[PDB]
Design an enzyme around this catalytic site. Structure first.
Site, PDB file in Angstrom:
ATOM      1  N   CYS A  30       0.832  -1.205   0.000  1.00 40.62           N
ATOM      2  CA  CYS A  30       0.000   0.000   0.000  1.00 40.62           C
ATOM      3  C   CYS A  30       0.874   1.265   0.000  1.00 40.62           C
ATOM      4  O   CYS A  30       0.534   2.274  -0.636  1.00 40.62           O
ATOM      5  CB  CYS A  30      -0.906   0.018   1.241  1.00 40.62           C
ATOM      6  SG  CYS A  30       0.026  -0.015   2.766  1.00 40.62           S
ATOM      7  N   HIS A 200      -2.177   1.692   7.053  1.00 39.40           N
ATOM      8  CA  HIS A 200      -2.444   1.455   5.644  1.00 39.40           C
ATOM      9  C   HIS A 200      -2.272   2.775   4.893  1.00 39.40           C
ATOM     10  O   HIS A 200      -2.828   3.784   5.318  1.00 39.40           O
ATOM     11  CB  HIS A 200      -3.882   0.945   5.509  1.00 39.40           C
ATOM     12  CG  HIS A 200      -4.260   0.537   4.124  1.00 39.40           C
ATOM     13  ND1 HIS A 200      -3.582  -0.437   3.427  1.00 39.40           N
ATOM     14  CD2 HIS A 200      -5.276   0.937   3.320  1.00 39.40           C
ATOM     15  CE1 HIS A 200      -4.163  -0.620   2.251  1.00 39.40           C
ATOM     16  NE2 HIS A 200      -5.194   0.202   2.162  1.00 39.40           N
ATOM     17  N   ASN A 220      -8.625   3.473  -2.301  1.00 38.62           N
ATOM     18  CA  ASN A 220      -7.924   2.360  -1.662  1.00 38.62           C
ATOM     19  C   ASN A 220      -7.274   1.599  -2.824  1.00 38.62           C
ATOM     20  O   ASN A 220      -7.534   1.907  -3.996  1.00 38.62           O
ATOM     21  CB  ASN A 220      -8.911   1.451  -0.916  1.00 38.62           C
ATOM     22  CG  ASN A 220      -8.222   0.573   0.101  1.00 38.62           C
ATOM     23  OD1 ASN A 220      -6.990   0.453   0.105  1.00 38.62           O
ATOM     24  ND2 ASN A 220      -9.010  -0.047   0.981  1.00 38.62           N
TER      25      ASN A 220
END
EC number: 3.4.22.1
Length: 254
Positions: A30, A200, A220
């Site tokens: 990520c 994240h 995301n």
């Protein structure tokens, strides 16, 4: 003077990457995805769409090395942007897209949802740093490098972050993922319960207020079947889950 709501996708409609959701696969990359996604957007914004490329997550993930952390095991957004300014990043699209110099080598998967793809598994091995483009792509790896002019963190201030996105494009950010975030579908996410699953990193591309609730529009990296077509909204203005505390960005070098 900043607008009450903003969506980078509407501000720069000729920049397709701003609308794109990627899939980091079964790899904790990520940190690299939030960076390359924002960088892609900024290169396009910076050149008034004359240049629009998908910057390679693979290049960053695989070639930055220990400076950026531990590849598929986690990493530092700050160093991701530093690598872009220091070593540059070549282009590279999605898994098996054959788009760009170094397309992503890790397969897409189902992130906390049922779907046609295999379910995601635990962070795998980090692919090797291969400094060469895929066959048929031009120019060479070295010539395809896109460099950052600079990189910086943005202060823990919603106004500073809004101003940064408004002027320069989407930024990378990071927040604490709790279990009550995993099944997000729509609306403004506000943490109420759950196990702290880990930090994240993501791409923040706008903001708004939904029924009185101020929020950040975030992309995301869990494919389009997770969340709201891959995006989500999260509470803005109270450094919710640390969303305003790990913002980093940078200006592209032509």
């Amino acid at each position: 003077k900043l607008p009450a709501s903003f969506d980078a996708r509407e501000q720069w409609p000729q920049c397709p990457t701003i609308k794109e959701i990627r899939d980091q696969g079964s790899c904790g990359s990520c940190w690299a995805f939030g960076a390359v996604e924002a960088i892609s957007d900024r290169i396009c914004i910076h050149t008034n769409a004359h240049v629009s490329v998908e910057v390679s997550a693979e290049d960053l993930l695989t070639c930055c090395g220990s400076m950026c952390g531990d590849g598929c095991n986690g990493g530092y957004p700050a160093e991701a942007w530093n690598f872009w300014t220091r070593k540059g990043l070549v282009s590279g699209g999605l898994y098996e897209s054959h788009v760009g110099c170094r397309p992503y080598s890790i397969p897409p998967c189902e992130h906390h949802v049922n779907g046609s793809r295999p379910p995601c598994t635990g962070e795998g091995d980090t692919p090797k740093c291969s400094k060469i483009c895929e066959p048929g792509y031009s120019p060479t790896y070295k010539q395809d490098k896109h460099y950052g002019y600079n990189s910086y963190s943005v202060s823990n201030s919603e106004k500073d972050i809004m101003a940064e996105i408004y002027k320069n494009g989407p930024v990378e950010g990071a927040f604490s993922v709790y279990s009550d975030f995993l099944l997000y579908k729509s609306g403004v996410y506000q943490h109420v319960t759950g196990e702290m699953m880990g930090g994240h990193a993501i791409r923040i591309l706008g903001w708004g207020v939904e029924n009185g609730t101020p929020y950040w529009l975030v992309a995301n990296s869990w494919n389009t079947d997770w969340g709201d077509n891959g995006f989500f909204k999260i509470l803005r203005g109270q450094d919710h889950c640390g969303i305003e505390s790990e913002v980093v960005a940078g200006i592209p070098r032509t």
